[PDB]
Every structure is written in C-alpha cells, then in structure tokens.
Amino acid sequence: RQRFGRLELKRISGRGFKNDEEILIGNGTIQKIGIWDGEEEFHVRCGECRGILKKSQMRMEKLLINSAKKEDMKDLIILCMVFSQDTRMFQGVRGEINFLNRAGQLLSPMYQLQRYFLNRSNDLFDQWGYEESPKASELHGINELMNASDYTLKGVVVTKNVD
Ligand SMILES: Nc1nc2c(ncn2[C@@H]2O[C@H](COP(=O)(O)OP(=O)(O)OP(=O)(O)O)[C@@H](O)[C@H]2O)c(=O)[nH]1
C-alpha cells in the first residue's frame, strides 16, 4: 500500500513500469518525471471519501467515488488526477511550480503538481472538461462543486448512498 500526500492507495490490478521522461508542462517548463506506463487499478482514499481509480499511461480512464464530505471528495479527485499523471493535468499548469519545503528545497515535480492543483483546482477542472453524466442507474455525474449534476468531470462518477 502507498501514500501520495493525503491520497492513500491500494493496488487492485495491473502493473506500472516507471520510465524517466522529460515532460513539457502547461507553463512552458520542462520537468523530469518518472512516468508510469501500463494499465493499473487502485482502491483510493482521501479522508472520508473512498473510490476506485483506473488509469493508463498519462491517463485517468475512470474514477468511481462515494458521496462524502465535499472537501474530501474534491481532494480525492484532484489527487487522483495528479497521481494518474494525466496529460490534461500537466497542461493545466499556468503558474510556477516552485514551492519550497520546510527545508529550503524545491519539492519534486509530482509533489509540486499535487500542491499546485490542491491550491488551484479550477486550473485543473477548466482544463479537464465536462461530458454528459452517465445515466446508468447507480451512478451520477459530479460537477466542480461536488454536486450531482447532468454534466460531470470527464471520467468521474459517484455512487449513491443506498440501503
Ligand atoms: N502509477 C503508479 N504510480 C506509483 C506507483 N508506485 C509509486 N507511484 C508514484 O510514483 C512516485 C514515485 O514514488 P516512489 O518510486 O515509490 O518513491 P519516491 O521517488 O521517493 O517518491 P515518494 O515515495 O512519493 O516520496 C510517487 O508519486 C508515487 O505516488 C505505482 O505502482 N503506479
């Protein structure tokens, strides 16, 4: 099991293979990043929100989460978008990613990105895009307010709390 900031993950399936790549991100800077290749699925948790994450190389394919405190839902979605290394997430960077840690050093790129988008989720969501919500009975779409809606952040769905 693994941790990516407040994101907690447990592998469900697949294997990732990391390759160092130079990535040209949205603010016109080149970052060196271990890019994970391959299909992978993870149980994911952030605080009280739990879900299933499906990803492939630089692509979040699907994110299924439960209803929870909105701040936990939103952070889970963002952390999953960053963790999946989605190209839309890389392209969403506008500002600088030059955060210093409590030690005077630059955070590593993936941790810059996590810190950046948790701070500027609109830069991510505007870049990410919306699509028609699934109409499968047990799922609904979710907008940037973490409200159920007819449109959803692409690839994200929420389960209803049903007894
Ligand atoms: N897609 C994918 N990402 C992983 C996997 N394992 C670790 N990561 C992520 O890849 C990055 C590098 O993590 P590691 O190789 O485990 O170790 P690290 O380079 O010291 O980085 P940290 O452990 O996060 O401090 C981290 O952001 C992890 O979240 C994996 O199996 N699949």
PDB file of C-alpha atoms and ligand atoms in Angstrom:
ATOM      1  CA  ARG A   1       0.000   0.000   0.000  1.00  0.00           C
ATOM      2  CA  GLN A   2       1.095   3.544  -0.773  1.00  0.00           C
ATOM      3  CA  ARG A   3       0.694   7.238   0.027  1.00  0.00           C
ATOM      4  CA  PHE A   4       0.752  10.249  -2.269  1.00  0.00           C
ATOM      5  CA  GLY A   5       0.260  13.150   0.079  1.00  0.00           C
ATOM      6  CA  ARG A   6      -3.172  12.704   1.573  1.00  0.00           C
ATOM      7  CA  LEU A   7      -4.005  10.151  -1.151  1.00  0.00           C
ATOM      8  CA  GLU A   8      -3.999   6.579   0.130  1.00  0.00           C
ATOM      9  CA  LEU A   9      -3.809   3.805  -2.478  1.00  0.00           C
ATOM     10  CA  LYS A  10      -4.103   0.025  -2.551  1.00  0.00           C
ATOM     11  CA  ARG A  11      -3.419  -1.810  -5.807  1.00  0.00           C
ATOM     12  CA  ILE A  12      -6.337  -3.677  -7.335  1.00  0.00           C
ATOM     13  CA  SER A  13      -4.856  -4.819 -10.612  1.00  0.00           C
ATOM     14  CA  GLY A  14      -2.289  -4.259 -13.326  1.00  0.00           C
ATOM     15  CA  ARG A  15       1.396  -3.317 -13.134  1.00  0.00           C
ATOM     16  CA  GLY A  16       3.043   0.047 -13.606  1.00  0.00           C
ATOM     17  CA  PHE A  17       6.539   0.436 -15.007  1.00  0.00           C
ATOM     18  CA  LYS A  18       8.217   3.771 -14.362  1.00  0.00           C
ATOM     19  CA  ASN A  19      10.359   5.494 -17.031  1.00  0.00           C
ATOM     20  CA  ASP A  20      12.053   8.852 -16.533  1.00  0.00           C
ATOM     21  CA  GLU A  21      10.678  11.216 -19.190  1.00  0.00           C
ATOM     22  CA  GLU A  22      11.053  14.921 -19.902  1.00  0.00           C
ATOM     23  CA  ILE A  23       7.568  16.413 -19.911  1.00  0.00           C
ATOM     24  CA  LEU A  24       6.721  19.841 -21.307  1.00  0.00           C
ATOM     25  CA  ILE A  25       4.044  21.021 -18.906  1.00  0.00           C
ATOM     26  CA  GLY A  26       1.418  23.717 -19.268  1.00  0.00           C
ATOM     27  CA  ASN A  27       3.546  26.642 -18.072  1.00  0.00           C
ATOM     28  CA  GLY A  28       6.142  26.037 -20.769  1.00  0.00           C
ATOM     29  CA  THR A  29       8.703  24.446 -18.478  1.00  0.00           C
ATOM     30  CA  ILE A  30      10.291  21.020 -18.932  1.00  0.00           C
ATOM     31  CA  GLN A  31      10.051  18.679 -15.912  1.00  0.00           C
ATOM     32  CA  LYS A  32      11.800  15.376 -15.342  1.00  0.00           C
ATOM     33  CA  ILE A  33       9.207  12.889 -14.134  1.00  0.00           C
ATOM     34  CA  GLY A  34       9.105   9.149 -13.678  1.00  0.00           C
ATOM     35  CA  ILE A  35       6.172   8.401 -15.958  1.00  0.00           C
ATOM     36  CA  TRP A  36       4.272   5.228 -15.132  1.00  0.00           C
ATOM     37  CA  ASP A  37       3.365   3.072 -18.116  1.00  0.00           C
ATOM     38  CA  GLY A  38       0.615   0.442 -18.158  1.00  0.00           C
ATOM     39  CA  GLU A  39      -2.956  -0.203 -17.065  1.00  0.00           C
ATOM     40  CA  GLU A  40      -3.464  -0.032 -13.293  1.00  0.00           C
ATOM     41  CA  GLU A  41      -6.364  -0.023 -10.862  1.00  0.00           C
ATOM     42  CA  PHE A  42      -6.246   1.217  -7.279  1.00  0.00           C
ATOM     43  CA  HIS A  43      -8.538   1.435  -4.299  1.00  0.00           C
ATOM     44  CA  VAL A  44      -8.172   5.099  -3.377  1.00  0.00           C
ATOM     45  CA  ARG A  45      -8.995   7.057  -0.250  1.00  0.00           C
ATOM     46  CA  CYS A  46      -8.779  10.656   0.881  1.00  0.00           C
ATOM     47  CA  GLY A  47     -10.197  11.225   4.350  1.00  0.00           C
ATOM     48  CA  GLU A  48     -13.796  10.003   4.368  1.00  0.00           C
ATOM     49  CA  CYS A  49     -14.024   9.606   0.573  1.00  0.00           C
ATOM     50  CA  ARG A  50     -13.219   6.213  -0.995  1.00  0.00           C
ATOM     51  CA  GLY A  51     -13.078   5.094  -4.594  1.00  0.00           C
ATOM     52  CA  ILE A  52     -11.785   3.039  -7.475  1.00  0.00           C
ATOM     53  CA  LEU A  53      -9.205   4.540  -9.810  1.00  0.00           C
ATOM     54  CA  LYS A  54      -8.483   3.136 -13.290  1.00  0.00           C
ATOM     55  CA  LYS A  55      -5.532   4.616 -15.173  1.00  0.00           C
ATOM     56  CA  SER A  56      -3.123   4.022 -18.037  1.00  0.00           C
ATOM     57  CA  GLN A  57      -0.037   5.903 -19.242  1.00  0.00           C
ATOM     58  CA  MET A  58      -0.631   9.593 -18.517  1.00  0.00           C
ATOM     59  CA  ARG A  59      -4.352   8.976 -18.494  1.00  0.00           C
ATOM     60  CA  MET A  60      -7.025   8.785 -15.862  1.00  0.00           C
ATOM     61  CA  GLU A  61      -9.529   6.436 -17.506  1.00  0.00           C
ATOM     62  CA  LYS A  62     -12.207   6.222 -14.816  1.00  0.00           C
ATOM     63  CA  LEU A  63     -12.758   7.370 -11.236  1.00  0.00           C
ATOM     64  CA  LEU A  64     -15.647   5.984  -9.222  1.00  0.00           C
ATOM     65  CA  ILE A  65     -16.121   7.506  -5.782  1.00  0.00           C
ATOM     66  CA  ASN A  66     -18.679   7.524  -2.996  1.00  0.00           C
ATOM     67  CA  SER A  67     -20.520  10.558  -1.642  1.00  0.00           C
ATOM     68  CA  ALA A  68     -18.682  12.137   1.276  1.00  0.00           C
ATOM     69  CA  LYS A  69     -17.672  15.456   2.773  1.00  0.00           C
ATOM     70  CA  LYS A  70     -17.230  17.739  -0.228  1.00  0.00           C
ATOM     71  CA  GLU A  71     -13.698  18.790   0.671  1.00  0.00           C
ATOM     72  CA  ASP A  72     -12.658  15.114   0.805  1.00  0.00           C
ATOM     73  CA  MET A  73     -14.409  14.331  -2.490  1.00  0.00           C
ATOM     74  CA  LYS A  74     -12.728  17.252  -4.268  1.00  0.00           C
ATOM     75  CA  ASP A  75      -9.263  16.484  -2.852  1.00  0.00           C
ATOM     76  CA  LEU A  76      -9.616  12.808  -3.798  1.00  0.00           C
ATOM     77  CA  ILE A  77     -10.497  13.716  -7.385  1.00  0.00           C
ATOM     78  CA  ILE A  78      -7.620  16.172  -7.679  1.00  0.00           C
ATOM     79  CA  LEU A  79      -5.089  13.850  -6.070  1.00  0.00           C
ATOM     80  CA  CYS A  80      -6.240  11.090  -8.447  1.00  0.00           C
ATOM     81  CA  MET A  81      -5.920  13.395 -11.463  1.00  0.00           C
ATOM     82  CA  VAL A  82      -2.381  14.277 -10.403  1.00  0.00           C
ATOM     83  CA  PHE A  83      -1.428  10.723  -9.458  1.00  0.00           C
ATOM     84  CA  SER A  84      -2.598   9.357 -12.834  1.00  0.00           C
ATOM     85  CA  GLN A  85      -0.209  11.858 -14.484  1.00  0.00           C
ATOM     86  CA  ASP A  86      -2.995  12.793 -16.866  1.00  0.00           C
ATOM     87  CA  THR A  87      -1.845  14.947 -19.801  1.00  0.00           C
ATOM     88  CA  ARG A  88      -4.752  17.326 -19.071  1.00  0.00           C
ATOM     89  CA  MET A  89      -3.365  17.778 -15.579  1.00  0.00           C
ATOM     90  CA  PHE A  90       0.133  18.524 -16.947  1.00  0.00           C
ATOM     91  CA  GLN A  91      -1.371  21.030 -19.405  1.00  0.00           C
ATOM     92  CA  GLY A  92      -3.362  22.736 -16.655  1.00  0.00           C
ATOM     93  CA  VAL A  93      -0.319  24.332 -15.010  1.00  0.00           C
ATOM     94  CA  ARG A  94      -0.297  28.113 -15.547  1.00  0.00           C
ATOM     95  CA  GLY A  95       1.684  29.484 -12.654  1.00  0.00           C
ATOM     96  CA  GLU A  96       5.128  28.437 -11.492  1.00  0.00           C
ATOM     97  CA  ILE A  97       5.616  25.176  -9.632  1.00  0.00           C
ATOM     98  CA  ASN A  98       8.457  26.365  -7.426  1.00  0.00           C
ATOM     99  CA  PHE A  99       7.178  25.541  -3.901  1.00  0.00           C
ATOM    100  CA  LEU A 100       9.867  25.185  -1.230  1.00  0.00           C
ATOM    101  CA  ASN A 101       9.555  22.576   1.530  1.00  0.00           C
ATOM    102  CA  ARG A 102      10.172  23.362   5.212  1.00  0.00           C
ATOM    103  CA  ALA A 103      13.837  22.677   4.401  1.00  0.00           C
ATOM    104  CA  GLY A 104      14.518  25.229   1.647  1.00  0.00           C
ATOM    105  CA  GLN A 105      14.441  22.701  -1.206  1.00  0.00           C
ATOM    106  CA  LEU A 106      12.134  22.519  -4.196  1.00  0.00           C
ATOM    107  CA  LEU A 107       9.508  19.812  -3.925  1.00  0.00           C
ATOM    108  CA  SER A 108       9.903  17.115  -6.589  1.00  0.00           C
ATOM    109  CA  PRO A 109       7.715  17.641  -9.709  1.00  0.00           C
ATOM    110  CA  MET A 110       4.837  15.307  -8.782  1.00  0.00           C
ATOM    111  CA  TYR A 111       4.626  16.897  -5.324  1.00  0.00           C
ATOM    112  CA  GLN A 112       4.743  20.389  -6.879  1.00  0.00           C
ATOM    113  CA  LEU A 113       1.793  19.388  -9.038  1.00  0.00           C
ATOM    114  CA  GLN A 114      -0.151  17.971  -6.118  1.00  0.00           C
ATOM    115  CA  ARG A 115       0.427  21.121  -4.063  1.00  0.00           C
ATOM    116  CA  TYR A 116      -0.324  23.343  -7.065  1.00  0.00           C
ATOM    117  CA  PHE A 117      -3.691  21.871  -8.017  1.00  0.00           C
ATOM    118  CA  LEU A 118      -4.950  21.367  -4.468  1.00  0.00           C
ATOM    119  CA  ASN A 119      -4.408  25.154  -4.323  1.00  0.00           C
ATOM    120  CA  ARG A 120      -5.775  25.919  -7.783  1.00  0.00           C
ATOM    121  CA  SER A 121      -8.359  23.252  -8.580  1.00  0.00           C
ATOM    122  CA  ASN A 122     -10.027  25.497 -11.171  1.00  0.00           C
ATOM    123  CA  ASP A 123      -6.881  25.392 -13.341  1.00  0.00           C
ATOM    124  CA  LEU A 124      -7.278  21.621 -13.361  1.00  0.00           C
ATOM    125  CA  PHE A 125     -11.054  21.379 -13.776  1.00  0.00           C
ATOM    126  CA  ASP A 126     -11.246  24.025 -16.526  1.00  0.00           C
ATOM    127  CA  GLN A 127      -8.599  22.085 -18.454  1.00  0.00           C
ATOM    128  CA  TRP A 128     -10.160  18.711 -17.679  1.00  0.00           C
ATOM    129  CA  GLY A 129     -13.562  19.315 -19.266  1.00  0.00           C
ATOM    130  CA  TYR A 130     -17.145  18.142 -18.799  1.00  0.00           C
ATOM    131  CA  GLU A 131     -19.157  15.415 -20.536  1.00  0.00           C
ATOM    132  CA  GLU A 132     -22.734  14.119 -20.271  1.00  0.00           C
ATOM    133  CA  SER A 133     -23.294  12.292 -16.986  1.00  0.00           C
ATOM    134  CA  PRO A 134     -23.653   8.519 -17.053  1.00  0.00           C
ATOM    135  CA  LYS A 135     -27.308   7.520 -16.882  1.00  0.00           C
ATOM    136  CA  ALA A 136     -26.647   4.035 -15.518  1.00  0.00           C
ATOM    137  CA  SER A 137     -28.966   3.721 -12.530  1.00  0.00           C
ATOM    138  CA  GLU A 138     -26.373   3.501  -9.754  1.00  0.00           C
ATOM    139  CA  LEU A 139     -24.058   6.273 -10.887  1.00  0.00           C
ATOM    140  CA  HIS A 140     -24.372  10.007 -11.199  1.00  0.00           C
ATOM    141  CA  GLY A 141     -22.174  12.764 -12.516  1.00  0.00           C
ATOM    142  CA  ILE A 142     -20.410  15.320 -10.393  1.00  0.00           C
ATOM    143  CA  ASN A 143     -19.566  18.960 -11.140  1.00  0.00           C
ATOM    144  CA  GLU A 144     -16.772  21.126  -9.765  1.00  0.00           C
ATOM    145  CA  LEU A 145     -18.944  21.958  -6.742  1.00  0.00           C
ATOM    146  CA  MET A 146     -19.081  18.230  -5.929  1.00  0.00           C
ATOM    147  CA  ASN A 147     -22.816  18.380  -6.636  1.00  0.00           C
ATOM    148  CA  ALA A 148     -24.711  15.718  -8.521  1.00  0.00           C
ATOM    149  CA  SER A 149     -25.466  17.062 -11.986  1.00  0.00           C
ATOM    150  CA  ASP A 150     -26.317  16.259 -15.605  1.00  0.00           C
ATOM    151  CA  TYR A 151     -22.734  17.036 -16.591  1.00  0.00           C
ATOM    152  CA  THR A 152     -19.668  15.506 -14.981  1.00  0.00           C
ATOM    153  CA  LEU A 153     -15.923  15.987 -14.864  1.00  0.00           C
ATOM    154  CA  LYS A 154     -14.829  13.596 -17.632  1.00  0.00           C
ATOM    155  CA  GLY A 155     -14.280  10.067 -16.327  1.00  0.00           C
ATOM    156  CA  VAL A 156     -15.568  10.720 -12.818  1.00  0.00           C
ATOM    157  CA  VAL A 157     -18.746   9.122 -11.426  1.00  0.00           C
ATOM    158  CA  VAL A 158     -20.274   8.905  -7.942  1.00  0.00           C
ATOM    159  CA  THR A 159     -22.225   6.069  -6.276  1.00  0.00           C
ATOM    160  CA  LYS A 160     -25.425   6.874  -4.395  1.00  0.00           C
ATOM    161  CA  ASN A 161     -25.628   6.021  -0.703  1.00  0.00           C
ATOM    162  CA  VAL A 162     -28.382   3.384  -0.853  1.00  0.00           C
ATOM    163  CA  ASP A 163     -29.602   0.906   1.757  1.00  0.00           C
TER     164      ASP A 163
HETATM  165  N1  LIG B   1       1.110   4.850 -11.335  1.00  0.00           N
HETATM  166  C1  LIG B   1       1.847   4.425 -10.312  1.00  0.00           C
HETATM  167  N2  LIG B   1       2.490   5.349  -9.520  1.00  0.00           N
HETATM  168  C2  LIG B   1       3.248   4.932  -8.481  1.00  0.00           C
HETATM  169  C3  LIG B   1       3.378   3.584  -8.191  1.00  0.00           C
HETATM  170  N3  LIG B   1       4.195   3.473  -7.116  1.00  0.00           N
HETATM  171  C4  LIG B   1       4.559   4.718  -6.722  1.00  0.00           C
HETATM  172  N4  LIG B   1       3.972   5.634  -7.558  1.00  0.00           N
HETATM  173  C5  LIG B   1       4.102   7.107  -7.540  1.00  0.00           C
HETATM  174  O1  LIG B   1       5.324   7.456  -8.168  1.00  0.00           O
HETATM  175  C6  LIG B   1       6.005   8.484  -7.467  1.00  0.00           C
HETATM  176  C7  LIG B   1       7.389   7.968  -7.071  1.00  0.00           C
HETATM  177  O2  LIG B   1       7.270   7.182  -5.904  1.00  0.00           O
HETATM  178  P1  LIG B   1       8.339   6.053  -5.460  1.00  0.00           P
HETATM  179  O3  LIG B   1       9.039   5.479  -6.672  1.00  0.00           O
HETATM  180  O4  LIG B   1       7.600   4.965  -4.720  1.00  0.00           O
HETATM  181  O5  LIG B   1       9.388   6.744  -4.439  1.00  0.00           O
HETATM  182  P2  LIG B   1       9.921   8.271  -4.498  1.00  0.00           P
HETATM  183  O6  LIG B   1      10.565   8.534  -5.842  1.00  0.00           O
HETATM  184  O7  LIG B   1      10.919   8.503  -3.386  1.00  0.00           O
HETATM  185  O8  LIG B   1       8.652   9.250  -4.301  1.00  0.00           O
HETATM  186  P3  LIG B   1       7.744   9.231  -2.967  1.00  0.00           P
HETATM  187  O9  LIG B   1       7.689   7.840  -2.377  1.00  0.00           O
HETATM  188  O10 LIG B   1       6.344   9.668  -3.336  1.00  0.00           O
HETATM  189  O11 LIG B   1       8.302  10.230  -1.976  1.00  0.00           O
HETATM  190  C8  LIG B   1       5.135   8.836  -6.272  1.00  0.00           C
HETATM  191  O12 LIG B   1       4.404   9.997  -6.590  1.00  0.00           O
HETATM  192  C9  LIG B   1       4.144   7.699  -6.142  1.00  0.00           C
HETATM  193  O13 LIG B   1       2.873   8.203  -5.787  1.00  0.00           O
HETATM  194  C10 LIG B   1       2.732   2.645  -8.981  1.00  0.00           C
HETATM  195  O14 LIG B   1       2.842   1.441  -8.740  1.00  0.00           O
HETATM  196  N5  LIG B   1       1.964   3.080 -10.039  1.00  0.00           N
END
